[PDB]
Design a protein around this ligand. Sequence first.
Ligand SMILES: [Cl-]
Length: 160
Amino acid sequence: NLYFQGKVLSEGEWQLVLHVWAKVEADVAGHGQDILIRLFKSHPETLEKFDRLKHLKTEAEMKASEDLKKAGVTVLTALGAILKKKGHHEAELKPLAQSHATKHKIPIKYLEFISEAIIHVLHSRHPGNFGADAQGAMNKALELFRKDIAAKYKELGYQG
Ligand SMILES: [Cl-]
């Protein structure tokens, strides 16, 4: 198994992140649904950034939406790919910052909101295997993502 040195997190922290993410990926649509519904319930203003979704008014409607299901898979597969770079994600963040800062106008604050939604859902679905250690390593990985993408927003002309 070829060693791939990561940045900022320790090797053991990266392994806790990628072990949990493998569980996410095995049911990506289900995790995606849960995370976006939690985001949209805790922070209803985020729903307005998704044109195909902004009309959905209840949890039953959100769970029935094929569009929300597709958005959830979009979000979690892009984030998983970034996490698997173990901090070597400069190239990946460039187009994501470009679309999110320039077209969608996503404030960095919403990335913090979805980070909270991700930790909440991971606790809810893996209550036996998402402990203090795994939670801390995931918080560090998402913090690094938010820090680096905030820096890319400013390189592309936007504060966010
Ligand atoms: Cl743990």
